Design a protein around this ligand. Structure first.
Ligand SMILES: C[C@H](OP(=O)(O)OC[C@@H](O)[C@@H](O)[C@@H](O)Cn1c2nc(=O)[nH]c(=O)c-2cc2ccc(O)cc21)C(=O)N[C@@H](CCC(=O)N[C@@H](CCC(=O)O)C(=O)O)C(=O)O
Ligand SMILES: C[C@H](OP(=O)(O)OC[C@@H](O)[C@@H](O)[C@@H](O)Cn1c2nc(=O)[nH]c(=O)c-2cc2ccc(O)cc21)C(=O)N[C@@H](CCC(=O)N[C@@H](CCC(=O)O)C(=O)O)C(=O)O
Ligand SMILES: NC(=O)c1ccc[n+]([C@@H]2O[C@H](COP(=O)([O-])OP(=O)(O)OC[C@H]3O[C@@H](n4cnc5c(N)ncnc54)[C@H](OP(=O)(O)O)[C@@H]3O)[C@@H](O)[C@H]2O)c1
Ligand SMILES: NC(=O)c1ccc[n+]([C@@H]2O[C@H](COP(=O)([O-])OP(=O)(O)OC[C@H]3O[C@@H](n4cnc5c(N)ncnc54)[C@H](OP(=O)(O)O)[C@@H]3O)[C@@H](O)[C@H]2O)c1
Ligand code: NA
Ligand code: NA
Lengths: 212, 212
């Protein structure tokens, strides 16, 4: 399928672009600046080898795709989603957004409502799927890295969720697990600050999670 | 050491009793009813083989221990801790309590403040350690069961946390991980409703978690 990675010029965007493009999916890296998206798309094609990855401004990337992933810091992702609502309302939108803050006593979940539900509200869409919150970007983007991670996925539209889970499942080392309706997104997003605390208090590097 | 399992006649108490008793610890199963605790202790002794396991009413078990684990449904566990506060304030108290509600649309976290922090306030004690929330009872109680799970542990008292983590570590298949101060207990407790949702929406059996 055609997958747009909005703000795909960054940390999580690189890993998704590399992993999905090598599986043959057509990737569009979106950026606030066309030249930056083009530059990153070129860098990603070079690393991946055989790959269809094109760069364009976010608005054009959103228009071109079937599925859009918001790989943007959450507070800004909400504004970008608002900007693009007439385009994105009709597409599958994946939210990997995590409202997390740091503090003297550790990392905390920083919102009273889940980021994914906030996005669904801004877009006035029933096709928001929440996923990818527990995939550490650096390890994910390292094509030499080996991992075995589970990816909880939430959402209210059965078809949209099925498409996203199927896509995630194609990536070797990832296993998507249905966590229910979008109202469970807070439980999924909360996994990230928990993981960051485990890393902090046990002196461990980047971690994902597995249910077993 | 001497470990009391308050409400240890139930699901989680059984597995803790069998695993810890075989490791040589003195176990006291507590119940609201003396006869029920004694009957369960007899059942547990039969299964574990050579082991020191006895049963008493909760108030007597709390008095006769060094570490007390609250293996009671969360709201009632808090009332029980309040009733036994003069005894428990002086012990290491382990809270595996999870505020979870099984709803029509899924499982939800049902408290604003974490269960562990509420117990700590009722006891006016800094020796409360939050742990064991993600250990599925039936699989844990099956002594033939093979498993590899991580156990996040929170608490504000270093010594108490160290004691509990050491105790958990003795059990083959369990790896305790420091998750920081007790203020992070809500993130740990929230793992349970997330797991229950995954079991429900993917049609899976009992699951634990691993950070990798
Ligand atoms: C710049 C980069 O990241 P950083 O600035 O340290 O980032 C700190 C954090 O943001 C980083 O730990 C995040 O992944 C934390 N994090 C999240 N952080 C957030 O702020 N929000 C999130 O939603 C998020 C989720 C998440 C999920 C799971 C998890 O384990 C961690 C998560 C970094 O330091 N890179 C490493 C190297 C990373 C790497 O993979 N490099 C390559 C080699 C590259 C070369 O050859 O030079 C490799 O190791 O093979 C380094 O320079 O030491
Ligand atoms: C179907 C039923 O149970 P179930 O739905 O299979 O089990 C669901 C869960 O409670 C169980 O998986 C728990 O471990 C879930 N669970 C937690 N459940 C919680 O309630 N709280 C927790 O904190 C919790 C944490 C947890 C951690 C990880 C994980 O994977 C699961 C966790 C069942 O087995 N019941 C018995 C009967 C029980 C009963 O009382 N029946 C009656 C007789 C009924 C008759 O006449 O048929 C009787 O015994 O009196 C049976 O039919 O075999
Ligand atoms: N890092 C992780 O390990 C990780 C893991 C799981 C989930 N996530 C989540 O995924 C999202 C992306 O994280 P990330 O680490 O990839 O972020 P990032 O690298 O810090 O930023 C990604 C991109 O967002 C764009 N951006 C920055 N400010 C913006 C603004 N004001 N408006 C629009 N776009 C803006 C930039 O692209 P342009 O400059 O090209 O426009 C940037 O490259 C976050 O919500 C995070 O919670 C991250
Ligand atoms: N089941 C799991 O897989 C699991 C896993 C991790 C954590 N936990 C947590 O551990 C705790 C215990 O779970 P559990 O499944 O073992 O529970 P449970 O079997 O339903 O109940 C445990 C015991 O609590 C006592 N009890 C019940 N109602 C009570 C009340 N109103 N007042 C006082 N005591 C009462 C009973 O003992 P007496 O009748 O003998 O007094 C009962 O045997 C919970 O907080 C739960 O969230 C459970
Ligand atoms: Na896969
Ligand atoms: Na162990």
């Amino acid at each position: 399928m055609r997958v747009a990675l909005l703000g795909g010029t960054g940390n999580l965007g690189k890993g998704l672009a590399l992993r999905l493009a090598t599986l043959g999916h057509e990737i569009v890296v979106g950026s606030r600046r066309e030249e930056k998206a083009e530059a990153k798309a070129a860098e990603y094609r070079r690393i991946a080898g055989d790959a269809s990855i094109t760069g364009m401004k976010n608005e054009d990337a959103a228009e071109a795709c079937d599925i859009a992933v918001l790989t943007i810091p959450w507070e800004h992702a909400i504004d970008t989603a608002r900007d693009l609502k007439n385009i994105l309302r009709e597409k599958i939108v994946v939210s990997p957004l995590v409202p997390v803050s740091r503090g003297a006593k550790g990392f905390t979940y920083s919102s009273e409502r889940s980021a994914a539900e906030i996005v669904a509200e801004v877009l006035e869409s029933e096709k928001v799927v929440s996923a990818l919150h527990t995939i550490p970007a650096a390890r994910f983007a390292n094509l030499d890295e080996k991992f075995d991670w589970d990816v909880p996925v939430c959402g209210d539209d059965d078809e949209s969720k099925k498409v996203v889970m199927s896509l995630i499942s194609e990536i070797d080392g990832l296993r998507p697990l249905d966590a229910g309706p979008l109202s469970n997104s807070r439980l999924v997003e909360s996994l990230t600050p928990l993981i960051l605390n485990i890393m902090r208090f046990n002196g461990m590097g980047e971690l994902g999670i597995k249910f077993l």
